[PDB]
Amino acid sequence: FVGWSTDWSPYADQSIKVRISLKSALGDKAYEWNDNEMYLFRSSVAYAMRQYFLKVKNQMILFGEEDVRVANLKPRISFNFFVTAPKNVSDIIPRTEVEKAIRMSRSRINDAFRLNDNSLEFLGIQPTLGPPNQPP
Amino acid sequence: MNNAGDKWSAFLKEQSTLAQMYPLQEIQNLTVKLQLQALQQNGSSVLSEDKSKRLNTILNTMSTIYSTGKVCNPDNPQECLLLEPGLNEIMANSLDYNERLWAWESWRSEVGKQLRPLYEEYVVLKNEMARANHYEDYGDYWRGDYEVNGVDGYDYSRGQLIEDVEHTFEEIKPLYEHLHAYVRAKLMNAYPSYISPIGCLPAHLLGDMWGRFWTNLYSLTVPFGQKPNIDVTDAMVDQAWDAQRIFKEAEKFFVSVGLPNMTQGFWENSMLTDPGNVQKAVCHPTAWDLGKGDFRILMCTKVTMDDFLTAHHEMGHIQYDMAYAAQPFLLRNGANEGFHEAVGEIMSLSAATPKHLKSIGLLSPDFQEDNETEINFLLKQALTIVGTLPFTYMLEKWRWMVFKGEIPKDQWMKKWWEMKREIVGVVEPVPHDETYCDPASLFHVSNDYSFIRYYTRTLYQFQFQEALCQAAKHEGPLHKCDISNSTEAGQKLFNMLRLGKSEPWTLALENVVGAKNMNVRPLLNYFEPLFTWLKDQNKNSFVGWSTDWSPYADQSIKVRISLKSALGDKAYEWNDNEMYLFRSSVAYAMRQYFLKVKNQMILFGEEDVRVANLKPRISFNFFVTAPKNVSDIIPRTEVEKAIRMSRSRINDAFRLNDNSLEFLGIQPTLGPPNQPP
Amino acid sequence: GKVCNPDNPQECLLLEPGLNEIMANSLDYNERLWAWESWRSEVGKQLRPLYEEYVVLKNEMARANHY
Ligand SMILES: *[C@@H]1O[C@H](CO)[C@@H](O[C@@H]2O[C@H](CO)[C@@H](O[C@@H]3O[C@H](CO)[C@@H](O)[C@H](O)[C@@H]3O)[C@H](O)[C@H]2NC(C)=O)[C@H](O)[C@H]1NC(C)=O
Ligand SMILES: *[C@@H]1O[C@H](CO)[C@@H](O[C@@H]2O[C@H](CO)[C@@H](O[C@@H]3O[C@H](CO)[C@@H](O)[C@H](O)[C@@H]3O)[C@H](O)[C@H]2NC(C)=O)[C@H](O)[C@H]1NC(C)=O
Ligand SMILES: *[C@@H]1O[C@H](CO)[C@@H](O[C@@H]2O[C@H](CO)[C@@H](O)[C@H](O)[C@H]2NC(C)=O)[C@H](O)[C@H]1NC(C)=O
Ligand SMILES: *[C@@H]1O[C@H](CO)[C@@H](O)[C@H](O)[C@H]1NC(C)=O
Ligand SMILES: *[C@@H]1O[C@H](CO)[C@@H](O)[C@H](O)[C@H]1NC(C)=O
Ligand SMILES: *[C@@H]1O[C@H](CO)[C@@H](O)[C@H](O)[C@H]1NC(C)=O
Ligand SMILES: *[C@@H]1O[C@H](CO)[C@@H](O)[C@H](O)[C@H]1NC(C)=O
Ligand SMILES: *[C@H]1O[C@H](CO)[C@@H](O)[C@H](O)[C@H]1NC(C)=O
Ligand SMILES: *[C@H]1O[C@H](CO)[C@@H](O)[C@H](O)[C@H]1NC(C)=O
Ligand SMILES: [Zn+2]
């Protein structure tokens, strides 16, 4: 096929897409999504990855906020992130492990930004509301 | 050199394998038994092949990391400094608190962290090697150098050395304390508002990278600056003292006490002068005993007092080497690891006396020494000799406790900096967690060398000098003693020198000092004139230190977290990931405050929120520094305002509400209660 | 400018030797990616603010010369 597309990228397969809706979940009194909020989000994701690698695989991996690479930032607050190895750029944590890590610690990420599972969508991680108990 | 060393090592190891045929349980001859012991030690050969190779690899890696470590200024990361040049100059010459702090912290965070895991593996492997050799741990193996057995009275157990150190140290503490106070009082005039008169000294202000010596502090602590120090180098230049006659003078000094002359080939084979740029050679003054009566000295000698004293020290080393020439090869060494340096150093101690300088002609006969000059000389001596003793003892104690396993692998720095505070009186300028490996940043630690040798040698020499001053019949103060023209003292010293390792070191000591164990009292006798003056100089100042003041303690905000109360059940554990999240939250709060109030974009990070005094209650102290400028601490008021501004987000991050997350100084407001119309 | 391997931060490579050899000879995707990203994150970020000031000053110089 002669030519090329301006949409494929070597990291595009392992990217998890985040979409954030501040104004809906908070109405008024909603903060602005400046670079400090992006820093906090990357720190939260790195913390989630640390927790997953410590409590499941029993490996101590020192992730950092600079290991959560973010692309395609858009005014909707919708972007793609992916997490690399602590100091090995060529190593990308496969998407399945990232999804499991996010599922494990999604509550903390939601609480950090005062969002609840509807304004903070990871586009591939569908939450569970919980079984409805039946009376005797 | 590589070929010769490999051949010698192979011969030694094969002879060690062969020597096992004769067990020590049946050997009755003392000399034979100890020679067989020397040739029977397995060393690293007792480990498996994989473990031995791993040990050699980690040793080599630590050595290269120490040798080629680089730290770079955050402003021009293109310029970087090694350790041996530049960084040593920065630590020994700069008077900028900020610059010295940067150098200290950068060296300990760029080479310490690289040395932590290697050092853990090194400890494990060395302990395994020692235990396979029937030692309880590696530290016991190191202490084994002083072991003496089967002499009926001279026996010196390994475990005794520890005691003989600690007890001895208990008698140096009265002197060191005063010195400490004095130095502290003198250091407040050079770094005002940084040193507290009630607390310890900051680690980076000690005139050296680790604080091992306090020599470079001398310019900031001279008692009487107006009186010059005794310098005779100019007199040597005027009398045209080349690097050929100073050795002749040292030889005359050695013969004056009855020691034998130099060998004929000694002068011919020596390298007393620098060979210029035509021939490359090392310039560290070293003694060589090639064997078969071949003794040589290598020194790039210049015309200075320091070179004169160094020549005397090296000639003492070679005199010791010649003394035990008759001993078998395995016996051709000092009594223990400390005797040789002490014997070499007493000569330099004696030759530096103004009396000897006057008698040789370098000092004019019309020169009367003032008590002020004696005080200055004594303090210069104490800043080197006494300054290193607490540091040496603390370092060796920490290493022994690590090797013995008394300190858990997750409590190394927390214990190390807890020791320096209450033994040396030195406090870290910024807190270090278990990631750092500060002790590994010293040369003798990363390159696997025994460090207690520098302690005992400090004592032994004085015990020698006093004894050699007793036989010489010297009446005045010890620091003015000279042993020249004292044949009795020379004979007494030679009576020990010829022994070598043939006899227990206790017996060698008994042949000079008349005692069996090391005794610190002569050292105090040496420094008594200074001690009194120090006691007179600290009438108003508070002698001692507290183990609670720290340079960062004023700007610290104290956090106390109560998880189990605010959450009851379903409460997470406060592992290091939660600490990471908390530091990230604090950095985010600081970023928000600096952006929305001062309209400055400052890139704080989780490594800029320094945390200390972590406790099981989850109660610690944090403080925030500048983004890349360690010497700059954000003042506490701004941090408090930043926390007040964004406390809601921090509370939400951990699901706590203003009662389980207390900042101890930031009191929240519940909100006014509305009144009806 | 120097970039260093994260494994042995004691060994560091300049641009003209080594790094050019790495980029023109290696067939390891991982090694070439490391070289590329390290060079652009260790010398690019140092050159961003200087380049902004350079653009502003050069534009002022040109405009003062009726360009
Ligand atoms: C950074 O992460 C990458 C993975 O994304 C690491 O690359 C991996 O390196 C190992 C070790 O060499 C490779 O295994 C070897 O594969 C070759 C290929 O045939 C084989 O000859 C060897 O016997 C061995 O099996 C692995 O394939 C490779 N993975 C990829 C995707 O390239 C890299 O080592 C990491 N960097 C560091 C410094 O650890
Ligand atoms: C890191 O932060 C520290 C502050 O904690 C900075 O030190 C400050 O540097 C400035 C610039 O030299 C000093 O101002 C100068 O003071 C001297 C002292 O008399 C004076 O001669 C000069 O005319 C000028 O006023 C300031 O005093 C100093 N502050 C402290 C507390 O030492 C340091 O520069 C920062 N590092 C970097 C790389 O920016
Ligand atoms: C222990 O062995 C040494 C080595 O033989 C004895 O010292 C002398 O060594 C020379 C040279 O090797 C021999 O010619 C002598 O026969 C050895 N003995 C004497 C008395 O000179 C040493 O004597 C031995 N010690 C004991 C207690 O037997
Ligand atoms: C040294 O190792 C050998 C086996 O390699 C063993 O027989 C011997 O007891 C060990 N100790 C000594 C002192 O030789
Ligand atoms: C030592 O040798 C020098 C010359 O090498 C000589 O002048 C001196 O007399 C000798 N020492 C003694 C005690 O004779
Ligand atoms: C030196 O002696 C004089 C005379 O007694 C005395 O006043 C002075 O304090 C002494 N100084 C020292 C340092 O001993
Ligand atoms: C030692 O003896 C020499 C030779 O008689 C003499 O010149 C010197 O003054 C004496 N005293 C000292 C301290 O050297
Ligand atoms: C939904 O189910 C998942 C497991 O399938 C569980 O982890 C999650 O907590 C549930 N959500 C609730 C109970 O709100
Ligand atoms: C308490 O008062 C402070 C200002 O004094 C305010 O920022 C804070 O929100 C108040 N707390 C409430 C309303 O819960
Ligand atoms: Zn020496």
Numbering used by the authors:
A (entry chain B): 603 to 738
B (entry chain A): 62 to 738
C (entry chain B): 130 to 196
Manuscript text:
SIT1 belongs to the SLC6 gene family of amino acid and amine transporters, and the larger Neurotransmitter Sodium Symporter (NSS) superfamily.
Single-particle cryo-EM analysis ultimately yielded a nominal 3.24 Å map of the ACE2-SIT1 complex, determined in the presence of pipecolate. This map was sufficiently detailed to model residues 10–582 of SIT1 and 21–768 of ACE2. Further classifying the 2:2 ACE2-SIT1 complex data, there are two distinct conformations based on the relative domain orientations within the ACE2 dimer. SIT1 is in an occluded conformation with the active site inaccessible to both the cytoplasm and extracellular space. Within the SIT1 binding site are two non-protein densities, identified as pipecolate and chloride based on size, local chemistry, and similarity to structures of other LeuT-fold transporters.
